[PDB]
Amino acid sequence: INTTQRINMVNNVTDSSFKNEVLESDLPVMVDFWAEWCGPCKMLIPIIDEISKELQDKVKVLKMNIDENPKTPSEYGIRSIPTIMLFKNGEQKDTKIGLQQKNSLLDWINKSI
Template sequence: MAKFGELIGVEKPVLIEFCANSNAAQNKINTLSSVAATLGKNAKVIKINVNENKALIDALDVQKTPTFMIYKKGEMQWRQTGLQDHKTLIGLVLNYV
């Protein structure tokens, strides 16, 4: 959990996708790669596997995947469960730059 605090405690926005291993995982990776490439140094983009991070998932009450969150300065700014396209995610993150 301390490591998670370090990840989200930065000045720039942090977009996190909580996901599970699936056949659709490659599509999600491509979406996140596109978001990360577009945002560049303006934001951090992170993917967290729910199956490998049970304590964190329980602490954040992630019930379904994918769940997206945006943090800034350690505080959650936005949260949504369900698929999101890269344009939507980029627009959302840019609100917090």
Template structure:
């Protein structure tokens, strides 16, 4: 089951998270939003403690919907270190969704590894 969050706890749960957060913006009237929940839960299971999955009801969180300029639902946004890294607004089936989400995570891991390497190299040069 997705952790459901609203505007007041968005800064803490998403922007302040120590791990990447995949935010599923949805609405009760959106059939596709409900259909992808099992795939999202499988994604979270596959990536275990490396990503947090949360749901935001866009109809109840209009300020967030406006802030992140939602054009369509469902919209999936991957946040890391308080920043939007990737956005998915359209996909073509379950396999496309799974592949795209996995690519998001691999991209995040590669970005994190290069930042760590750059920091380490900098520290080594300074020493």
């Protein structure tokens, strides 16, 4: 018996802190745009948690609730969720829409950084 990999925890970013935590970072940043009413989003949350650990010190992983923070998704053209957006050096680098499984998500991020 060991500690579970279900960290069930990852930092939140808001419309107030997006520039500060995402656009100003030197690390590549992955942002999971989500809401509580979105079924696929809830399936994706634990995957995002696990990937944050597997990508520690390489990619900063954050989630943004779009009910509470509608302005940032609007600015980057997000029309549906789940959306996962990758940022580097103050700009968007890549985006994918929809549930993504863990291996595919890790493959994509590693290809992108």
